[PDB]
Symmetry: C2
Subunit: 57 residues, 2 copies
């Protein structure tokens, strides 16, 4: 229903944000293997936010 569907969409949104913010942090630290994995993680996080926005938006 609306409140738990909305909060599922809001969790997918802040996870997409957090993968950008952690990629920036990994990049300042010079941690290049981890920064690649986090860039890719941000690709998956995007696809899930789009999927959740399509269903619950």
């Amino acid at each position: 229903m609306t409140k738990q569907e909305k909060t599922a969409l809001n969790m997918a949104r802040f996870i997409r944000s957090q993968t950008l913010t952690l990629l920036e942090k990994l990049n300042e630290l010079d941690a290049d293997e981890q920064a690649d994995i986090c860039e890719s993680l941000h690709d998956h996080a995007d696809e899930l936010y789009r999927s959740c926005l399509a269903r619950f938006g």
Copy 2:
């Protein structure tokens, strides 16, 4: 250890936590197509944390 390295690790752990909570909540909402992407996302969140734990913790 740098403080910043620990900020990176805690956030990689958070994303690990939340893609999993969101995965279970998407299964509770019977949202199959979204639960499929979130399981793959959580897997990579888990992978990023293992990598960052080895390097920063």
